Amino acid sequence: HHMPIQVLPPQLANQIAAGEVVERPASVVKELVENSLDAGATRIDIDIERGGAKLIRIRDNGCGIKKDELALALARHATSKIASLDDLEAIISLGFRGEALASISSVSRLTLTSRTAEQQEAWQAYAEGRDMNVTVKPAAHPVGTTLEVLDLFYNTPARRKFLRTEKTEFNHIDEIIRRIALARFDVTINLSHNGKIVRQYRAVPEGGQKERRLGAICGTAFLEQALAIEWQHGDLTLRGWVADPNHTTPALAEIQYCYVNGRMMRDRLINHAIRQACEDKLGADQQPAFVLYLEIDPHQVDVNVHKHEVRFHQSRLVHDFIYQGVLSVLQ
Amino acid sequence: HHMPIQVLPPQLANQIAAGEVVERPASVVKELVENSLDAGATRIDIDIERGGAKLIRIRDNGCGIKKDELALALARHATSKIASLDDLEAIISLGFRGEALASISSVSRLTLTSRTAEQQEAWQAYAEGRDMNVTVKPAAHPVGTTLEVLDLFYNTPARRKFLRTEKTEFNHIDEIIRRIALARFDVTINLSHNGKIVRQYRAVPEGGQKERRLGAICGTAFLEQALAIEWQHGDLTLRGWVADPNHTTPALAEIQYCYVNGRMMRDRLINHAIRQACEDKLGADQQPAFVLYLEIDPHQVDVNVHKHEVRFHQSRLVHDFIYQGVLSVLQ
Numbered sequence A, B: 001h002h003m004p005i006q007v008l009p010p011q012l013a014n015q016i017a018a019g020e021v022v023e024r025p026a027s028v029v030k031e032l033v034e035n036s037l038d039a040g041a042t043r044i045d046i047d048i049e050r051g052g053a054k055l056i057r058i059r060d061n062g063c064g065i066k067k068d069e070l071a072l073a074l075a076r077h078a079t080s081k082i083a084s085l086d087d088l089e090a091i092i093s094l095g096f097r098g099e100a101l102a103s104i105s106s107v108s109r110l111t112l113t114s115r116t117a118e119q120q121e122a123w124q125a126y127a128e129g130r131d132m133n134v135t136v137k138p139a140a141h142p143v144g145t146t147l148e149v150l151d152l153f154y155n156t157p158a159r160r161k162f163l164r165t166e167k168t169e170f171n172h173i174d175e176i177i178r179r180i181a182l183a184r185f186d187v188t189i190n191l192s193h194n195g196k197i198v199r200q201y202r203a204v205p206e207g208g209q210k211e212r213r214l215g216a217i218c219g220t221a222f223l224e225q226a227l228a229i230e231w232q233h234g235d236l237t238l239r240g241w242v243a244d245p246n247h248t249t250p251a252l253a254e255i256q257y258c259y260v261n262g263r264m265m266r267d268r269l270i271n272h273a274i275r276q277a278c279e280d281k282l283g284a285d286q287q288p289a290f291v292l293y294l295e296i297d298p299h300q301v302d303v304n305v306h307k308h309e310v311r312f313h314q315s316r317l318v319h320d321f322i323y324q325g326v327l328s329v330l331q
């Protein structure tokens, strides 16, 4: 009670928010790449420097951001993805909170450059000062967008001390891209570190062969033991690959990716049902290797938990669904 | 790009926030009880109805909220706990985001009643409408505060469908109070459900016997096997109780509470070090039973992660510290 209840200034408020949204360089990559995806990009190019502690540049060939909305994109609680509660309950995009860019900009030197198809001119924007005032100025850029994040945590020292080695931080970034690339086979994703190419996942044309990308992302080892899955029942449909439990090594066990309507996730309900389907067919219980995609009525699952967490309205039903699907294929 | 980037109205913005802050009735209880603690309360009384889906009332004998700050308490990004980045890096209170009440009020009928020692008059406040306009009116109330949360999720149907049985929801509430009561032995906490008293933990006077409350919260079973711990090394000090691994049952295994400077938490680093100290002394590896308190330089740990998660600057050091402390006592 000694200090009055007082509104937190823009920058400070965003930095506090950044504490949750910006865990490490990998977090920034995730947020930006997901924005490119929402913007309908077909190709995303990612350049990293020193594990991302020095630089993170992500360019996409998405639809871009209109000049008069650049500042809004750097603003808090402002989005183009939902306008009401209905939109949220049945969301189509990955984003909707309208907080990511604002948060990131408050704890780094973030530059937003973009041009829409209707604009002849490209523009660049960035916020500054305790009030996060935005400067918009001329720039050069093709249809699409480029986010440039420099000196992450430069103005938040307590956090900068927690940054691990360049090697460790880049690895988390590599892992993040790995999870996103598996979610969208139709999107070309290139990742580079310190001026050198680390990877590039070619987009798979309509109906093209996926085994190619799967192997490129997860490795040939997984690709060989990969058992495809096709299991449906109304709104519930399970797809993907499950490695033969009998031929699953701990190295392959590193591949445990699950998705709910394209949204990457790590839910215990699912990991359990799978390990159950394997333990029940196989002899011993162990860490299975898989890449599964669950399609379900968006109204039967909560995506606003805070991101890899989700909540299923019919917990039991879903769990048994996945269990059967995997169990079935394992036999 | 079809829909413009647009600011989310106050109520909607808060409801989206509520998706993360308000997981279930237990979340509301946690936020409110922690506010009472920050306000210096010595006694907190909690009344629940129908698992909290119908009513949640929390009254404290804290310092209260000044009339002219009631609306600010229901506002977003407004707090009395930090005013800058320094304050955050070495925080003293549990709160600091200034978002909890605003979020909760947007997804329930929340009434805030309070009176400070300097005021002869008590006042009541609550927000309404898409803009969250606040109404302040006369009320009766002793020094302190009472939060009243009714019909949780009444205006967010998609979420209301996820509410479990009254029994299940109250249980999470009981568990939450359990964790908070262990964090503060000096605070009397009474919990009631549907007009009937479920529990009441008496505050322990200065230096009074703690075994009494420990047993009342964790049960006599744990109290008997409880092995006290006193282990320090500079800023690092470990205290609490660890149940004899050899006499630990799965029922006792339900008691795994760890705290960093009074802030409840569930960090794997610690749970691992403990289970390691037990596995290494004991024969088999298992689920230990414990109530440990780690005191550490606030600058060596990050509390703004999003709450039971924390991040230690010197991960390895801390882990070995706890391991030794427990290991030592187990012998």
Ligand SMILES: Nc1ncnc2c1ncn2[C@@H]1O[C@H](COP(=O)(O)OP(=O)(O)O)[C@@H](O)[C@H]1O
Binding pocket: A031, A035, A036, A039, A060, A062, A063, A064, A065, A073, A078, A079, A080, A081, A094, A095, A096, A097, A098, A099, A100, A101, A102, A144, A145, A146, B004, B005
């Ligand atoms: N690469 C991009 N291409 C096009 N629009 C983008 C891009 N990145 C961000 N935006 C715009 O900025 C707004 C989002 O910023 P963000 O802070 O990520 O919030 P959110 O995605 O939850 O709405 C989006 O709603 C969209 O309108």
Ligand SMILES: Nc1ncnc2c1ncn2[C@@H]1O[C@H](COP(=O)(O)OP(=O)(O)O)[C@@H](O)[C@H]1O
Binding pocket: A004, A005, B031, B035, B036, B039, B060, B062, B063, B064, B065, B073, B078, B079, B080, B081, B094, B095, B096, B097, B098, B099, B100, B101, B102, B144, B145, B146
């Ligand atoms: N029970 C209470 N007694 C006194 N002050 C309170 C109480 N509950 C809330 N407040 C005030 O309301 C503001 C907090 O609301 P909240 O949304 O919980 O945010 P935070 O605790 O993170 O600041 C506090 O900063 C404090 O000034």
Ligand SMILES: [Mg+2]
Binding pocket: A031, A034, A035, A094, A095, A096, A100
């Ligand atoms: Mg986004």
Ligand SMILES: [Mg+2]
Binding pocket: B031, B034, B035, B094, B095, B096, B100
């Ligand atoms: Mg609070």
